[PDB]
Amino acid sequence: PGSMENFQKVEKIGEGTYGVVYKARNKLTGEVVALKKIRLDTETEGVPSTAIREISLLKELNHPNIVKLLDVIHTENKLYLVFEFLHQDLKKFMDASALTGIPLPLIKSYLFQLLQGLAFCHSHRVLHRDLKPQNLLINTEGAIKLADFGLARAFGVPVRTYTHEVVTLWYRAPEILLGCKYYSTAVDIWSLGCIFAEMVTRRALFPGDSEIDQLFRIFRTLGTPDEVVWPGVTSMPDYKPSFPKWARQDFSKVVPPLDEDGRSLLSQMLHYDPNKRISAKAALAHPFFQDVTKPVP
Amino acid sequence: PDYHEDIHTYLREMEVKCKPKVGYMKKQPDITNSMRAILVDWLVEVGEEYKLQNETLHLAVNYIDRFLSSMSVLRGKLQLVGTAAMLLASKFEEIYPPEVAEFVYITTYTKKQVLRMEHLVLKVLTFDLAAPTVNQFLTQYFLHQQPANCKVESLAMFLGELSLIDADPYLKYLPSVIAGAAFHLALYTVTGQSWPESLIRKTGYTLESLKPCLMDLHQTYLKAPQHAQQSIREKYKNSKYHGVSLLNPPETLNL
Numbered sequence: 001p002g003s004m005e006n007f008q009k010v011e012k013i014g015e016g017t018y019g020v021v022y023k024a025r026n027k028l029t030g031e032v033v034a035l036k037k038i039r040l041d042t043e044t045e046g047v048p049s050t051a052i053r054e055i056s057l058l059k060e061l062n063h064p065n066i067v068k069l070l071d072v073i074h075t076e077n078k079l080y081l082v083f084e085f086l087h088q089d090l091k092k093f094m095d096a097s098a099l100t101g102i103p104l105p106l107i108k109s110y111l112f113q114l115l116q117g118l119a120f121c122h123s124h125r126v127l128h129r130d131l132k133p134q135n136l137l138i139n140t141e142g143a144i145k146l147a148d149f150g151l152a153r154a155f156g157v158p159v160r161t162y163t164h165e166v167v168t169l170w171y172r173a174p175e176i177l178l179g180c181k182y183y184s185t186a187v188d189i190w191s192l193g194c195i196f197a198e199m200v201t202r203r204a205l206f207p208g209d210s211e212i213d214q215l216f217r218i219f220r221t222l223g224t225p226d227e228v229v230w231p232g233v234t235s236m237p238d239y240k241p242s243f244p245k246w247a248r249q250d251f252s253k254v255v256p257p258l259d260e261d262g263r264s265l266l267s268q269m270l271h272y273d274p275n276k277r278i279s280a281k282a283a284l285a286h287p288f289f290q291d292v293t294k295p296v297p
Numbered sequence: 298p299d300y301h302e303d304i305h306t307y308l309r310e311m312e313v314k315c316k317p318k319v320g321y322m323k324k325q326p327d328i329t330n331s332m333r334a335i336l337v338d339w340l341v342e343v344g345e346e347y348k349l350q351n352e353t354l355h356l357a358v359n360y361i362d363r364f365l366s367s368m369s370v371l372r373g374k375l376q377l378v379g380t381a382a383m384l385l386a387s388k389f390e391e392i393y394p395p396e397v398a399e400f401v402y403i404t405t406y407t408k409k410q411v412l413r414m415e416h417l418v419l420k421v422l423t424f425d426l427a428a429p430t431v432n433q434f435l436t437q438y439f440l441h442q443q444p445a446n447c448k449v450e451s452l453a454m455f456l457g458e459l460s461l462i463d464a465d466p467y468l469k470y471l472p473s474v475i476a477g478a479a480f481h482l483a484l485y486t487v488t489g490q491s492w493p494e495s496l497i498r499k500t501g502y503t504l505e506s507l508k509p510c511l512m513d514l515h516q517t518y519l520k521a522p523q524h525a526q527q528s529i530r531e532k533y534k535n536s537k538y539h540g541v542s543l544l545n546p547p548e549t550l551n552l
């Protein structure tokens with residue numbers, strides 16, 4: 001439907017994983033959009049797998065908490081993905097809120113919306129695999145949406161072994177760090193748990209500088225897992241018996257400002273055993289959300 | 298797990314929207330079902346050679362059937378369509394897809410042509426690549442056997458794969474139904490057992506509803522060693538698939 005002559009660049013938003021994102025406006029309708037420009041390797045690997053997956057998956061996923069793909073404009077050289085325009089990502093918003101903090105009801109609203117978006121993905125056999133604040137977009141009406149599905153994939157039932165090189169380090173689940181042969185929807189929940197904590201404490205929960213540092217940061221907080229808490233841990237490929245054995249921290253310390261319900265939810269989202277980790281579906285029913293509202297940011 | 302029912306349901310919706318047109322080869326002036334069989338049998342070889350997932354194979358076939366449903370193709374260009382389809386399915390599905398040069402090597406087209414076809418295939422399919430396959434249904438059906446059985450799985454996969462070869466008749470069946478037939482046919486061949494009750498609840502398919510596809514599939518199975526195309530039988534001799542293509546097909550089903 002589209003053609004690039006009708007769009008006027010307003011400003012470049014930046015360069016993520018792939019492509020470049022701009023703010024643009026439709027000259028004819030006045031619609032403000034976000035354009036993701038993707039270079040095709042016309043010589044000579046062609047259309048990138050990331051673009052193929054992002055496009056194919058986002059065209060299936062219609063949901064108010066998933067960024068809406070409006071058009072794909074082809075040329076021989078370039079692909080432009082036309083998306084609805086959202087003015088802010090959650091990373092930039094957490095910075096802007098560093099002094100005063102994000103109000104607990106907005107935190108609750110945002111987490112609620114992220115879980116609805118994620119349950120929709122999971123219901124439609126899609127794993128996101130890069131949930132992090134920079135990939136979560138907010139508008140002025142109090143909405144937040146999942147975005148950048150460049151790292152996503154359509155999964156099967158049951159899953160088979162997928163790409164190991166996965167999720168930004170700080171938001172990466174233990175099962176991935178430990179080199180598990182199978183991972184699934186639980187990885188996304190782990191990421192969201194990290195994000196929930198980060199909204200509360202105003203700092204990344206597990207800011208690791210390396211894989212081993214990331215694990216150890218997780219262990220120091222949640223306790224080093226054993227076969228009791230996580231049947232199977234010690235048979236995982238990158239598990240080592242030399243792992244120091246830290247005690248689990250009282251959750252009133254992990255996330256001080258949180259109520260009993262909040263702590264209950266967070267600890268379910270961060271359960272070590274992916275099988276017992278709460279589903280997005282189940283988390284929506286958690287008592288934490290009983291009084292959920294929709295504040296404007 | 299959890300989402301299993303939601304996913305099943307949603308794939309049942311999507312297999313109707315990703316279904317090619319059953320009549321399409323009659324509208325193709327220069328290609329035939331026999332040419333298509335050859336193409337698909339070559340893709341089987343390619344999957345082996347590069348050790349590609351079976352899912353990748355099934356996806357590529359879907360892409361090809363949908364592309365040919367809308368676009369007239371001369372016979373000299375059919376393999377170009379097929380190579381581009383396999384490339385795309387690899388990009389979608391594989392952890393390590395082969396590089397474009399590897400897809401040039403296996404064909405003779407130029408690299409530029411393959412790469413240009415890739416883009417045309419994407420346009421014709423409007424980037425709708427997340428198509429449900431026979432394989433994705435089988436995989437869920439496999440969670441129901443009591444107990445799990447190796448040969449049942451590999452034989453089912455083999456029979457689903459044979460279905461890819463023959464547009465007439467298998468284009469007229471949905472992936473979920475072919476998977477059902479293949480699963481039951483495999484189960485009965487190996488263990489004497491039948492389409493489980495739990496799968497009737499899940500799918501709302503019964504042995505009766507599966508009969509037409511099953512009658513066709515059983516025939517395909519019996520006639521397999523005399524099929525012009527043999528790469529799937531070869532592939533399924535390997536221990537990787539427990540030699541299942543060597544097994545003798547049953548002669549009746551007493552349904």
Ligand SMILES: Nc1nc(OCC2CCCCC2)c2nc(C(F)(F)F)[nH]c2n1
Nearest residue numbers: 013014015016021034083086087088089
């Ligand atoms: N405000 C905002 N931010 C986005 O992404 C944030 C990152 C920040 C780093 C530069 C790449 C984009 C966006 N990405 C999109 C798009 F994916 F295009 F939808 N829209 C966006 N709107």
